[PDB]
Amino acid sequence: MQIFVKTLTGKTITLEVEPSDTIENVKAKIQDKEGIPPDQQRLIFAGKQLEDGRTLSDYNIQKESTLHLVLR
Ligand SMILES: [Zn+2]
Ligand SMILES: [Zn+2]
Ligand SMILES: [Zn+2]
Ligand SMILES: [Zn+2]
């Protein structure tokens, strides 16, 4: 599954993931791409705040879905 993560500046990160990847796994991948620490990352998909220990398929994230890094 290819997904897109937009940073707070709107830069697109493209990631290759599996349905069972956790959000914590996705935060690690974002750290590798952009140097953003996982504990500073907050992700949203379709208005939903994404929890570290749940999976992409738990949130119905699919091929070409876009997630956003946001502020609290
Ligand atoms: Zn894939
Ligand atoms: Zn696998
Ligand atoms: Zn994985
Ligand atoms: Zn795996």
From Swiss-Prot:
Membrane disposition: Peripheral membrane protein
Residues where (Microbial infection) ADP-ribosylthreonine is found: T66
Documented effect of changing R72A: Impairs ubiquitination by CRL2(KLHDC3) E3 ligase complex. Impairs ubiquitination by CRL2(KLHDC3) E3 ligase complex
Substitution effect: K48R: No effect on HLTF-mediated polyubiquitination of PCNA. Impairs ubiquitination by CRL2(KLHDC3) E3 ligase complex
Variant or mutagenesis effect after changing I44D: Impairs ubiquitination by CRL2(KLHDC3) E3 ligase complex. Impairs ubiquitination by CRL2(KLHDC3) E3 ligase complex
Result, substituting T9D: Impairs ubiquitination by CRL2(KLHDC3) E3 ligase complex
Effect listed in the UniProt record for changing S65A: Prevents phosphorylation in case of mitophagy. Decreased localization of PRKN to mitochondria
Record site feature (Interacts with activating enzyme), residues: R54, R72
Result of changing R54D: Decreases affinity for UBE2R2 in CRL2(FEM1C)-UBE2R2 complex
Modified residues annotated as Phosphoserine in this record: S65
Domain of life: Eukaryota
Modification(s) after translation: Phosphorylated at Ser-65 by PINK1 during mitophagy. Phosphorylated ubiquitin specifically binds and activates parkin (PRKN), triggering mitophagy. Phosphorylation does not affect E1-mediated E2 charging of ubiquitin but affects discharging of E2 enzymes to form polyubiquitin chains. It also affects deubiquitination by deubiquitinase enzymes such as USP30. Mono-ADP-ribosylated at the C-terminus by PARP9, a component of the PPAR9-DTX3L complex. ADP-ribosylation requires processing by E1 and E2 enzymes and prevents ubiquitin conjugation to substrates such as histones.
Site (Essential for function): H68
Occurrences of domain Ubiquitin-like (ranges): 1-72
Crosslinked residue numbers (Glycyl lysine isopeptide (Lys-Gly) (interchain with G-Cter in ubiquitin)): K6, K11, K27, K29, K33, K48, K63
Effect of S65E: Phosphomimetic mutant that binds and activates PRKN
Record function comment: Exists either covalently attached to another protein, or free (unanchored). When covalently bound, it is conjugated to target proteins via an isopeptide bond either as a monomer (monoubiquitin), a polymer linked via different Lys residues of the ubiquitin (polyubiquitin chains) or a linear polymer linked via the initiator Met of the ubiquitin (linear polyubiquitin chains).
Protein name: Ubiquitin
Source species of the chain: Homo sapiens (Human)
Gene: UBC
Residues of the full protein shown: 1 to 72 of 685
